[PDB]
Amino acid sequence: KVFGRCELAAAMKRHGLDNYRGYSLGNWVCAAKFESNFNTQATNRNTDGSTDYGILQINSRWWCNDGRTPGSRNLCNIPCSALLSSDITASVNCAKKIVSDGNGMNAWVAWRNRCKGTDVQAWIRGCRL
Ligand SMILES: [Cl-]
Ligand SMILES: [Cl-]
Ligand SMILES: [Cl-]
Ligand SMILES: [Cl-]
Ligand SMILES: [Cl-]
Ligand SMILES: [Cl-]
Ligand SMILES: [Cl-]
Ligand SMILES: [N]
Ligand SMILES: [N]
Ligand SMILES: [N]
Ligand code: NA
Ligand SMILES: [Pt+2]
Ligand SMILES: [Pt+2]
Ligand SMILES: [Pt+2]
Ligand SMILES: [Pt+2]
Ligand SMILES: [Pt+2]
């Protein structure tokens, strides 16, 4: 599923992401934009052989199992495929664990490079919330 901007903002709010670990909804929508362009089925292979999955491009080296990332962990205890669902529950639950890991949203490189410090509120502007 390819979410609309305000559609995803509403979904992320419903699932407890607004101000989670102090990160406003705009930060999460911005991260999703530049990680996946709001496409739940987005996948991208990394040079180390791990793969990023879903709207927030969660990685298989630590967070989910895809059965082809040697030495990896599965800290969210999910198959990576669960992160590709039209329902973002799995991605949100896992993202909450990631953002609590110590480095906040810096875990998402695209967030640090393209969202951090910017007017992230613009990503939820005009949206019914
Ligand atoms: Cl957009
Ligand atoms: Cl915001
Ligand atoms: Cl594996
Ligand atoms: Cl699995
Ligand atoms: Cl959803
Ligand atoms: Cl959830
Ligand atoms: Cl933080
Ligand atoms: N939820
Ligand atoms: N949830
Ligand atoms: N949903
Ligand atoms: Na894994
Ligand atoms: Pt879909
Ligand atoms: Pt939820
Ligand atoms: Pt929660
Ligand atoms: Pt777009
Ligand atoms: Pt939902």
UniProtKB/Swiss-Prot annotation:
Q: Does the keyword Isomerase apply?
A: no
Q: Which residues bind substrate?
A: 101
Q: Which family does it belong to?
A: Belongs to the glycosyl hydrolase 22 family.
**Function as written in the Swiss-Prot or TrEMBL entry:** Lysozymes have primarily a bacteriolytic function; those in tissues and body fluids are associated with the monocyte-macrophage system and enhance the activity of immunoagents. Has bacteriolytic activity against M.luteus.
| Subunit comment | Monomer.
Catalytic reaction equation(s): Hydrolysis of (1->4)-beta-linkages between N-acetylmuramic acid and N-acetyl-D-glucosamine residues in a peptidoglycan and between N-acetyl-D-glucosamine residues in chitodextrins
Among its keywords, does the record have Hydrolase? yes
Which residue positions are annotated as catalytic? Answer: 35, 52
For this entry, list what GO says about its biological process.
Answer: cell wall macromolecule catabolic process; defense response to bacterium; defense response to Gram-negative bacterium; defense response to Gram-positive bacterium; killing of cells of another organism
Q: Which Pfam families match?
A: Lys (PF00062)
Q: Which cysteines are joined by disulfide bonds?
A: 6-127, 30-115, 64-80, 76-94
Protein name (Swiss-Prot/TrEMBL): Lysozyme C
List GO terms (cellular component aspect).
cytoplasm; endoplasmic reticulum; extracellular space
Subcellular location per UniProt equals:
Secreted
Q: Which UniProt keywords apply?
A: Allergen, Antimicrobial, Bacteriolytic enzyme, Disulfide bond, Glycosidase, Hydrolase, Secreted, Signal
Note from the entry: Lysozyme C is capable of both hydrolysis and transglycosylation; it also shows a slight esterase activity. It acts rapidly on both peptide-substituted and unsubstituted peptidoglycan, and slowly on chitin oligosaccharides.
Q: Name one GO molecular function term.
A: beta-N-acetylglucosaminidase activity
Q: Which organism is it from?
A: Gallus gallus (Chicken)
Q: Might you give the EC number(s) for this enzyme?
A: 3.2.1.17
